[PDB]
Amino acid sequence: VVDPFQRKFQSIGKIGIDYSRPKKLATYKRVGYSVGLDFPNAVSMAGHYSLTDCTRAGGAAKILM
Amino acid sequence: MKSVITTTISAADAAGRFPSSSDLESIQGNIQRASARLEAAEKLSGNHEAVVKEAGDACFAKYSYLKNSGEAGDSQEKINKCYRDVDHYMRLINYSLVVGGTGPLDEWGIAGSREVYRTLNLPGSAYIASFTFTRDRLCVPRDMSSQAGVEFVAALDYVINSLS
Amino acid sequence: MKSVITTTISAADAAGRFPSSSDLESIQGNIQRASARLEAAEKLSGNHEAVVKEAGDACFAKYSYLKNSGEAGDSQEKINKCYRDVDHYMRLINYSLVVGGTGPLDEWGIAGSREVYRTLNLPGSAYIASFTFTRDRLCVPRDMSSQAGVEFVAALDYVINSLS
Amino acid sequence: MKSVITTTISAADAAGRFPSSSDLESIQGNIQRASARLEAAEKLSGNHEAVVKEAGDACFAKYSYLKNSGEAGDSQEKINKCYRDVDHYMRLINYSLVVGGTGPLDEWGIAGSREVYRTLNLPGSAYIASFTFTRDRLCVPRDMSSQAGVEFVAALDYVINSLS
Amino acid sequence: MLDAFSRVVVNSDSKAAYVGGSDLQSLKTFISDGNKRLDAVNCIVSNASCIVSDAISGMICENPGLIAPGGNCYTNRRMAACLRDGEIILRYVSYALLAGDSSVLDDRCLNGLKETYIALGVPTASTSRAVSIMKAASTAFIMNTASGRKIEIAAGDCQALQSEAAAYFDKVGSAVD
Amino acid sequence: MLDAFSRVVVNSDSKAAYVGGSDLQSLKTFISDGNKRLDAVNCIVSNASCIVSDAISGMICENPGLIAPGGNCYTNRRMAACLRDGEIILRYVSYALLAGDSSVLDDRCLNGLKETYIALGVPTASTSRAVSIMKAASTAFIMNTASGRKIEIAAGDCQALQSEAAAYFDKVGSAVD
Amino acid sequence: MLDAFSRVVVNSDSKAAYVGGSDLQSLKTFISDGNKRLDAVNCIVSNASCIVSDAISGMICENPGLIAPGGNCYTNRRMAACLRDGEIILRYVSYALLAGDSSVLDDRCLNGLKETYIALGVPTASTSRAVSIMKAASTAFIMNTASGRKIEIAAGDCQALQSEAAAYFDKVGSAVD
Amino acid sequence: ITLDTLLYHPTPTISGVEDKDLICYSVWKQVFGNAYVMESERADAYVPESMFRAGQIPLREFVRGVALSATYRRRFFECCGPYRAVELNFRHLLGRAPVSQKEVSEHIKLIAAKGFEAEINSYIDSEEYEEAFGDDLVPYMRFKGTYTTCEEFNRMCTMYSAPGTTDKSLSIRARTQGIENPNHVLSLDGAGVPSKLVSIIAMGSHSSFVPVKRALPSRPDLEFGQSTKAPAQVNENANPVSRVEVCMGSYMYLTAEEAAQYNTDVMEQDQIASYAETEISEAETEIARLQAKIAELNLI
Numbered sequence A: 001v002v003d004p005f006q007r008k009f010q011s012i013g014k015i016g017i018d019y020s021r022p023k024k025l026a027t028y029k030r031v032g033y034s035v036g037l038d039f040p041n042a043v044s045m046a047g048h049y050s051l052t053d054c055t056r057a058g059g060a061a062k063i064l065m
Numbered sequence B, C, D: 001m002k003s004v005i006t007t008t009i010s011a012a013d014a015a016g017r018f019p020s021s022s023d024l025e026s027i028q029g030n031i032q033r034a035s036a037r038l039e040a041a042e043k044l045s046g047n048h049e050a051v052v053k054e055a056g057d058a059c060f061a062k063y064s065y066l067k068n069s070g071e072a073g074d075s076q077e078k079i080n081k082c083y084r085d086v087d088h089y090m091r092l093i094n095y096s097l098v099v100g101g102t103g104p105l106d107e108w109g110i111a112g113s114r115e116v117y118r119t120l121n122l123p124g125s126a127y128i129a130s131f132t133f134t135r136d137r138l139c140v141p142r143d144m145s146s147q148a149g150v151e152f153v154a155a156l157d158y159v160i161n162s163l164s
Numbered sequence E, F, G: 001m002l003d004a005f006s007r008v009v010v011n012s013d014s015k016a017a018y019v020g021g022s023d024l025q026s027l028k029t030f031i032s033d034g035n036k037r038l039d040a041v042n043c044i045v046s047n048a049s050c051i052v053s054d055a056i057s058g059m060i061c062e063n064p065g066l067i068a069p070g071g072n073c074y075t076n077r078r079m080a081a082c083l084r085d086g087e088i089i090l091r092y093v094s095y096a097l098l099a100g101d102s103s104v105l106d107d108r109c110l111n112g113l114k115e116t117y118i119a120l121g122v123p124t125a126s127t128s129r130a131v132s133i134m135k136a137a138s139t140a141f142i143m144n145t146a147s148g149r150k151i152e153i154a155a156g157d158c159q160a161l162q163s164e165a166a167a168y169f170d171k172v173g174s175a176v177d
Numbered sequence H: 001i002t003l004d005t006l007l008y009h010p011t012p013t014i015s016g017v018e019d020k021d022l023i024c025y026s027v028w029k030q031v032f033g034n035a036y037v038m039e040s041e042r043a044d045a046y047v048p049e050s051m052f053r054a055g056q057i058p059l060r061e062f063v064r065g066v067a068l069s070a071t072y073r074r075r076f077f078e079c080c081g082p083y084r085a086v087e088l089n090f091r092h093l094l095g096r097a098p099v100s101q102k103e104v105s106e107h108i109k110l111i112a113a114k115g116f117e118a119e120i121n122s123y124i125d126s127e128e129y130e131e132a133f134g135d136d137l138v139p140y141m142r143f144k145g146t147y148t149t150c151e152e153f154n155r156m157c158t159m160y161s162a163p164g165t166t167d168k169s170l171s172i173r174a175r176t177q178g179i180e181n182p183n184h185v186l187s188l189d190g191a192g193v194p195s196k197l198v199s200i201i202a203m204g205s206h207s208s209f210v211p212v213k214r215a216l217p218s219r220p221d222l223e224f225g226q227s228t229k230a231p232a233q234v235n236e237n238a239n240p241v242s243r244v245e246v247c248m249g250s251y252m253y254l255t256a257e258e259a260a261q262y263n264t265d266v267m268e269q270d271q272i273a274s275y276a277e278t279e280i281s282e283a284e285t286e287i288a289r290l291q292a293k294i295a296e297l298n299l300i
């Protein structure tokens, strides 16, 4: 169907359609929304975050970054 | 049939360990609250018929349209199904009242009620009218002790919160 | 940290339901056996040093070869590790004695003991000699309430059955 | 019964593929070290009774309190259980010595030893005293072919590291 | 998972000593106050679904933008999950009422919830409003001051325990922000 | 899973009526006898591993064919599983001692135990022997007549409860045959 | 899983040949009759829950031993599972109404059901009675002869298809015995 | 309602060290299908426990890590038939019955292509796994009212059998292999006997009902209700003379009153018999006398 990796990268669906079994809070902490950042252009924004993670997907801290 | 002792035995079984002092304290509390539960069960076995009679009469008292067409208890037979079902309710409140957990009341009466009630067009609110009638009506010192009355009220409250 | 209330909270959580009357009866039993547990904890906090002293002295009394070469506590330092470890044991018996379950005693002292004991060449039977000896030493009545002596013996029995 | 050929057959089976040249080289090494293993098995089958006799006598020589009372077997029958169990140990060292892997020694003697030893109050360190006696004793050349000696020592070392 | 008992134990382990008279004394006050605590738990349990209904309906009433089309309370399924979550929040608050120590709620449900509701776009101030409604509702049931409820129990002081339950609700509503 | 409470309940459901005075009366005798029951459970728990060790070692002693090569007790792993099964049998017997109704053991462990033994070639008479040793051992601990154990508890009558525990062991040993 | 199309295919594969004019001809009669078949499916779907309610309530009415205490319809949970199973049986009958070949029902639901209801103590004659009530109910809806239902569709002959649906119900009720 | 509520498996979200211990223990039930794992086999799949108790690796992957270990492998992959490997690996992890020949044949075409590890990755990384239970619970006895094939419930309940029972069939294994003595058989192996399902899988029919009954959890209304009923006395005064025993061949005849009197007598001299431990404790006081000699030797 869909390769496991891409599923780790992809968004957590909704409960009423995408999954019957209600997810817990740690699984939003572990995968969630995963998007990497462009390389930033000033001294002020450079040191605070990794541009992107590879073979890893964080979730909902990436929203705040 | 969740009770004190079934929970602790199932839990110590889930650990796979022998029952430590904790479970022993739990069943110690079971034989503490036992006397109040059983006194309530004795008086419930005393006058259950008038309990069901007042409950059903109050139920048709609040809602007259149960005897309207053809939507509900429009025969003497279906009103016999009414006092029949409330007899089962007081029978389960007696059973769970003896056990001291909601377990037999849960597994026999509660589980899957809402599918039957939505399917055979039975509104739950009329049952709530009956139980809240027997809820409002309970005596303060006059028949049973506060624990006996409290225990009864608690069990019936569980019924209401599980019904709707 | 298995106790009455941790078991019932974990169990009603495992059902995902509100705490019914059963759990309330369980913690009612917890405050029943509370006074005997805490009396035992008070006296244990009283004279723990002489308890560990008699336990260790009896432990080397039964087995002299602990001070033989080079296999065991052949220094004053390692005998200080002896009374040190029995201080930890009485500290955990105090803790579980306060809690009323074997939980903190289990998770802090018991779990994975046998790997350390087989690895650092520590025979468990000497510990069993210590616990058993103190066990006999405690008074039936004079030193604590009848329920309390029992509570202490029960906890220490758990230690023995978990040790070997 | 892990050996060379059982590992390679199980591994190429786990791939689901035909045995390539790698496995053939592995069993080639098995028939290389074969002669030294089997020579050790021949001499072990030679004088096993005096091996068990010196091992058990050294075991009670290091620890006298085995015949103290109930801590250790104090009967002639339980010392017959002693030389019995060391006969089983040398029997398993013979078997694994023939196989060339620790497998039959592992699955028959090693697996789950520590539960029985902690349960029936058997201290492992006395077994270690026996095996380290037979370990120290080997004279290498003049007792047997030097290489066989290494094989024997290796097997017995595995026993010690698996025991405690 | 901690009991108040176990909280005293872990304090004694960090102090590395035995129990001592003062911690035992405060724990004796806990045990003597325990029956009031159990009665409070029975009060909050016996009206729980009703509290959830009134609290969530009041949350929708104080701002109808949630039921306005496109909002989170706007749809039928999402309303079901709304009632479900209010029920579960009330459930762990009740568990904290038996326990007397917040650590069961702190490690069970309070952990990761803020970043979940951020991860789903659930408005946090509306949730804290619902937690506030269950706070005042639970204190009104805990003091028998409900306008449609009357328990028949002997009078006494329980205001410390009321402030305890309000501390749990303010912990949740503080931690979902 | 039944309690003795729940056994009275199911009897009342098969009778289709309420509880009635007699069943309540016998249940009152259960509750008044309950502390002896808990004390008995504490006795059997506090010496459990020791009972298992002595019982299984006595089973091996009464016939050394089990440890004779080819037998089931003959090997190290299979001896570990032997001690394990004796421990678990004692565990469910203890659960039946708290419950006062055998239905937990009847549906949990007694069901299919015989079939498992038949499948494994485990000699059933030897198992029933081990259950008999745990029977007399458990009655000796339950009456404080152990030759190396002395509990310090007020004297009274518990022979009905001793016969109860012997009824559980005879149920197991009857049902493993 | 077979269609009537696929049933013709498997017949041609067992015959090892091509399709031939006769099987195509009968399949043309199927296609020309197909819209009546779809209309029949819409009729049985549009009153399905109602059929299940009336059929199961009539099953309880024709013998009140089921609701008598100890019976299978006697309890609340078990009544829920009763309504559920009647719904699912009606569901696979509807699938056989679209398919025109019974093999989907034969391999999906009809297989192992008899030995399941034997394995649970469900009375088979009562189940076959419920299947009979859904049979006559489904034929009454399929011929618009319901006493409280009137569809507005052009008149035509469908008695072959009515006998087809009755053949499915008689297959189920025959195979649950 | 599917009968899941009658059964009881807890798995809490990980809050303390306790919850970690219960969850680990329940996993090694379910992965091994109640097989007995000793210390060394406990120490086989170690590394997944550390990565799970650290919480760095989720729960389905702890289950994968335990399934990939050598012990589970040698029991349930190695010394089983190819089918038997498939429905065992299928029972432990997905907890169902193989639905059809295609499903099992596709797994076996996957084993001939790739072998065991890519299989276990197929069972874990299947979707029906993940939506059935994913990182939340441990595998368990699946009840679901909607069943893809009514046969699913049926063959799954034949897979499970009794709650007390386990998979090994030495006697079954013993007869087919040429061994007179079953216990003479290696016990590390044993999960491989004929595949119980495959008759029903290939033919698609007539699943037995006796096997199905065992697996049913015990129903509080039905099977408990028939079991106990011994009530009342027809006479207020019936005196039976029953027989008690005071050895193998020595036999007493008493009535209930008189037997009660006899037993009370046995209690009267049972205090007398239990006197002996005071002699034991007094004799132990003598240890103190021995110690006094040690005290004298220290003072000399």
Ligand SMILES: C=CC1=C(C)[C@@H](Cc2[nH]c(/C=C3N=C(/C=C4\NC(=O)[C@H](C)[C@H]4CC)C(C)=C\3CCC(=O)O)c(CCC(=O)O)c2C)NC1=O
Residues within 6 Å of the ligand: A039, A040, A045, A046, A047, A048, A049, A050, A051, A052, A053, A054, A055
């Ligand atoms: C302005 C430019 C700019 C960058 C280019 C990054 C570079 C960068 N990356 C990290 C930090 C990191 N970067 C990575 C990335 C990696 N993960 C892997 O598996 C791969 C080897 C690699 C991606 C290809 C990881 C994993 C961390 C966290 C490392 C850790 O905490 O162990 C940090 C430390 C601060 C932090 O934790 O975010 C910095 C400065 N940050 C910046 O400000």
Ligand SMILES: C=CC1=C(C)[C@@H](Cc2[nH]c(/C=C3N=C(/C=C4\NC(=O)[C@H](C)[C@H]4CC)C(C)=C\3CCC(=O)O)c(CCC(=O)O)c2C)NC1=O
Residues within 6 Å of the ligand: C059, C066, C072, C073, C074, C078, C079, C081, C082, C083, C085, C086, C088, C089, C108, C109, C116, C120, C122, C123, C126, C127
């Ligand atoms: C929280 C609970 C807790 C315990 C119960 C102890 C248990 C314990 N004891 C030792 C370690 C030790 N324990 C002893 C004790 C013994 N000396 C003997 O003669 C007797 C057999 C025995 C006392 C009855 C000795 C001698 C050591 C040091 C062993 C060595 O270094 O050889 C160690 C290793 C670390 C160390 O060296 O201290 C640990 C974990 N520690 C804990 O944290």
Ligand SMILES: C=CC1=C(C)[C@@H](Cc2[nH]c(/C=C3N=C(/C=C4\NC(=O)[C@H](C)[C@H]4CC)C(C)=C\3CCC(=O)O)c(CCC(=O)O)c2C)NC1=O
Residues within 6 Å of the ligand: C043, C044, C045, C046, C047, C048, C050, C051, C137, C138, C139, C140, C143
């Ligand atoms: C917290 C728990 C706790 C206990 C259980 C006790 C245990 C205990 N008992 C004694 C001490 C003692 N205990 C006893 C008791 C005995 N007399 C006999 O005839 C019997 C064998 C036995 C009662 C059954 C006696 C006689 C002493 C004094 C011994 C002596 O000085 O010779 C001591 C030494 C300190 C002292 O002299 O009091 C201790 C620690 N103390 C504690 O703090």
Ligand SMILES: C=CC1=C(C)[C@@H](Cc2[nH]c(/C=C3N=C(/C=C4\NC(=O)[C@H](C)[C@H]4CC)C(C)=C\3CCC(=O)O)c(CCC(=O)O)c2C)NC1=O
Residues within 6 Å of the ligand: D056, D059, D066, D072, D073, D078, D079, D081, D082, D083, D085, D086, D088, D089, D108, D109, D116, D120, D122, D123, D126, D127, D130, F057, F060, F067, F074, F075, F076, F079
């Ligand atoms: C196939 C390999 C194999 C072994 C290696 C043995 C290992 C073994 N030994 C014992 C059992 C025993 N083993 C010993 C031996 C000891 N006596 C002591 O003084 C010393 C510490 C030690 C000898 C060095 C004793 C005394 C027992 C009986 C223990 C008891 O009943 O208290 C048992 C339990 C069953 C029994 O009672 O026989 C087992 C499995 N058995 C096997 O099947």
Ligand SMILES: C=CC1=C(C)[C@@H](Cc2[nH]c(/C=C3N=C(/C=C4\NC(=O)[C@H](C)[C@H]4CC)C(C)=C\3CCC(=O)O)c(CCC(=O)O)c2C)NC1=O
Residues within 6 Å of the ligand: B033, B147, B150, C021, C024, C025, C028, E035, E036, E038, E039, E040, E042, E043, E142, E143, E144, E153, E154, E155, E156, E157, E158
């Ligand atoms: C198993 C369930 C279970 C319960 C639910 C309780 C219910 C309960 N509460 C009390 C008893 C009590 N309960 C309260 C509680 C109150 N204080 C107030 O200010 C409020 C009105 C209210 C808390 C909301 C008080 C104050 C008492 C003592 C009353 C008194 O002695 O005057 C008693 C009498 C015994 C005792 O004194 O403890 C009982 C049975 N007990 C149980 O076993």
Ligand SMILES: C=CC1=C(C)[C@@H](Cc2[nH]c(/C=C3N=C(/C=C4\NC(=O)[C@H](C)[C@H]4CC)C(C)=C\3CCC(=O)O)c(CCC(=O)O)c2C)NC1=O
Residues within 6 Å of the ligand: A014, A015, A016, A022, A023, A024, A025, E066, E071, E072, E073, E074, E078, E079, E081, E082, E083, E085, E086, E088, E089, E108, E109, E113, E116, E120, E122, E123, E126, E127, E130
């Ligand atoms: C143990 C504690 C515990 C909780 C507290 C909840 C918290 C929680 N809520 C949701 C999920 C949800 N929660 C709500 C609730 C809301 N609807 C609104 O209009 C309001 C803003 C709000 C009620 C006040 C909704 C609507 C969803 C579904 C969101 C969506 O799918 O869009 C989810 C994701 C999984 C799911 O879909 O169910 C979780 C973890 N779950 C738990 O396990």
Ligand SMILES: C=CC1=C(C)[C@@H](Cc2[nH]c(/C=C3N=C(/C=C4\NC(=O)[C@H](C)[C@H]4CC)C(C)=C\3CCC(=O)O)c(CCC(=O)O)c2C)NC1=O
Residues within 6 Å of the ligand: B024, B025, B028, C033, C147, C150, F035, F036, F038, F039, F040, F042, F043, F141, F142, F143, F144, F153, F154, F155, F156, F157, F158
């Ligand atoms: C939480 C744990 C816990 C326990 C372990 C028990 C322990 C215990 N047992 C008794 C009390 C009792 N226990 C027994 C038991 C005995 N009968 C005999 O023949 C044997 C010697 C022994 C069983 C092996 C008897 C007979 C009494 C009543 C004694 C009497 O009144 O004379 C009492 C006093 C209160 C009562 O009368 O019930 C207590 C606290 N209670 C608890 O709360």
Ligand SMILES: C=CC1=C(C)[C@@H](Cc2[nH]c(/C=C3N=C(/C=C4\NC(=O)[C@H](C)[C@H]4CC)C(C)=C\3CCC(=O)O)c(CCC(=O)O)c2C)NC1=O
Residues within 6 Å of the ligand: F066, F072, F073, F074, F078, F079, F081, F082, F085, F086, F088, F089, F108, F109, F113, F116, F120, F122, F123, F126, F127, F130, H034, H035, H036, H163, H164, H165, H166, H168, H187
């Ligand atoms: C819930 C209840 C419950 C039980 C009652 C047991 C029953 C049981 N025992 C064994 C398994 C076993 N049981 C024994 C026990 C025996 N050794 C002998 O010498 C005697 C004949 C007998 C003790 C009296 C042995 C030796 C094994 C292992 C057999 C083998 O592998 O050869 C197994 C197979 C799984 C395993 O290896 O552990 C099972 C299901 N298990 C359960 O889950």
Ligand SMILES: C=CC1=C(C)[C@@H](Cc2[nH]c(/C=C3N=C(/C=C4\NC(=O)[C@H](C)[C@H]4CC)C(C)=C\3CCC(=O)O)c(CCC(=O)O)c2C)NC1=O
Residues within 6 Å of the ligand: G066, G072, G073, G074, G077, G078, G079, G081, G082, G083, G085, G086, G088, G089, G108, G109, G113, G116, G120, G122, G123, G126, G127, G130, H001, H002, H003, H143, H144, H145, H146, H147, H148, H149, H150, H153
């Ligand atoms: C794919 C096809 C398919 C089916 C055909 C059903 C068949 C079926 N029914 C039940 C289960 C059940 N089925 C019924 C039904 C009955 N109630 C009675 O009064 C009558 C005798 C009968 C309706 C005519 C009941 C009551 C149960 C629950 C039985 C119980 O728990 O006691 C179960 C066990 C699981 C469960 O509890 O749901 C199964 C597999 N399920 C499927 O997946």
Ligand SMILES: C=CC1=C(C)[C@@H](Cc2[nH]c(/C=C3N=C(/C=C4\NC(=O)[C@H](C)[C@H]4CC)C(C)=C\3CCC(=O)O)c(CCC(=O)O)c2C)NC1=O
Residues within 6 Å of the ligand: G035, G036, G038, G039, G040, G042, G043, G141, G142, G143, G144, G153, G154, G155, G156, G157, G158
């Ligand atoms: C997508 C959904 C969908 C449907 C549900 C059907 C509905 C439908 N049925 C018919 C048409 C028809 N439907 C029927 C069916 C009936 N015969 C009787 O005896 C019964 C009353 C009834 C079956 C229960 C008949 C007989 C016709 C032809 C009517 C005529 O030509 O006289 C037509 C007109 C076109 C045609 O002739 O096929 C349509 C749209 N078509 C669709 O596209």
Ligand SMILES: C=CC1=C(C)[C@@H](Cc2[nH]c(/C=C3N=C(/C=C4\NC(=O)[C@H](C)[C@H]4CC)C(C)=C\3CCC(=O)O)c(CCC(=O)O)c2C)NC1=O
Residues within 6 Å of the ligand: H046, H047, H048, H049, H050, H051, H053, H054
């Ligand atoms: C595959 C490789 C691999 C590793 C290398 C380990 C690494 C590792 N160690 C721990 C965990 C641990 N590791 C140690 C070890 C230490 N004790 C100290 O005094 C020293 C600082 C240090 C030894 C030198 C301790 C004590 C813990 C438990 C920590 C705790 O629970 O507080 C954990 C968390 C899971 C667990 O509790 O086991 C992990 C992943 N695990 C693996 O899977």
Ligand SMILES: CCC1=C(C)[C@@H](CC2=N/C(=C\c3[nH]c(C[C@@H]4NC(=O)C(C)=C4CC)c(C)c3CCC(=O)O)C(CCC(=O)O)=C2C)NC1=O
Residues within 6 Å of the ligand: E050, E051, E054, E055, E057, E058, E059, E061, E062, E133, E136, E137, E140, E141, E145, E146, E147, E148, E149
């Ligand atoms: C039209 C949309 C709408 C609602 C829905 C309600 C919801 C609501 N209930 C309140 C508060 C509230 N609700 C209840 C519970 C409730 N009352 C009882 O007597 C019983 C038996 C109850 C459950 C059935 C209590 C007990 C209070 C406290 C006020 C009081 O004393 O009644 C409050 C006040 C909040 C605050 O103080 O900040 C609101 C907004 N209001 C709305 O505008």
Ligand SMILES: CCC1=C(C)[C@@H](CC2=N/C(=C\c3[nH]c(C[C@@H]4NC(=O)C(C)=C4CC)c(C)c3CCC(=O)O)C(CCC(=O)O)=C2C)NC1=O
Residues within 6 Å of the ligand: F050, F051, F054, F055, F057, F058, F059, F061, F062, F132, F133, F136, F137, F140, F141, F145, F146, F147, F148, F149
């Ligand atoms: C030589 C091979 C051999 C054995 C091994 C023993 C095993 C054994 N123990 C028994 C019975 C038995 N065993 C114990 C347990 C045991 N005793 C204690 O006081 C403590 C602390 C124990 C564990 C360490 C008790 C308590 C009894 C009951 C008899 C008694 O009062 O001592 C019985 C009697 C069984 C019966 O009554 O039917 C036997 C056969 N016998 C043998 O012939």
Ligand SMILES: CCC1=C(C)[C@@H](CC2=N/C(=C\c3[nH]c(C[C@@H]4NC(=O)C(C)=C4CC)c(C)c3CCC(=O)O)C(CCC(=O)O)=C2C)NC1=O
Residues within 6 Å of the ligand: G050, G051, G053, G054, G057, G058, G061, G132, G133, G136, G137, G140, G141, G145, G146, G147, G148, G149
């Ligand atoms: C007193 C105990 C009792 C019952 C309960 C009924 C149950 C019942 N319904 C029938 C049959 C039946 N039932 C319905 C369904 C039903 N009718 C509708 O119009 C709507 C909307 C319905 C659900 C609310 C239909 C449509 C039929 C077919 C007959 C008809 O045309 O009405 C039949 C005939 C069975 C047969 O043909 O073999 C029976 C026995 N009968 C009883 O004696």
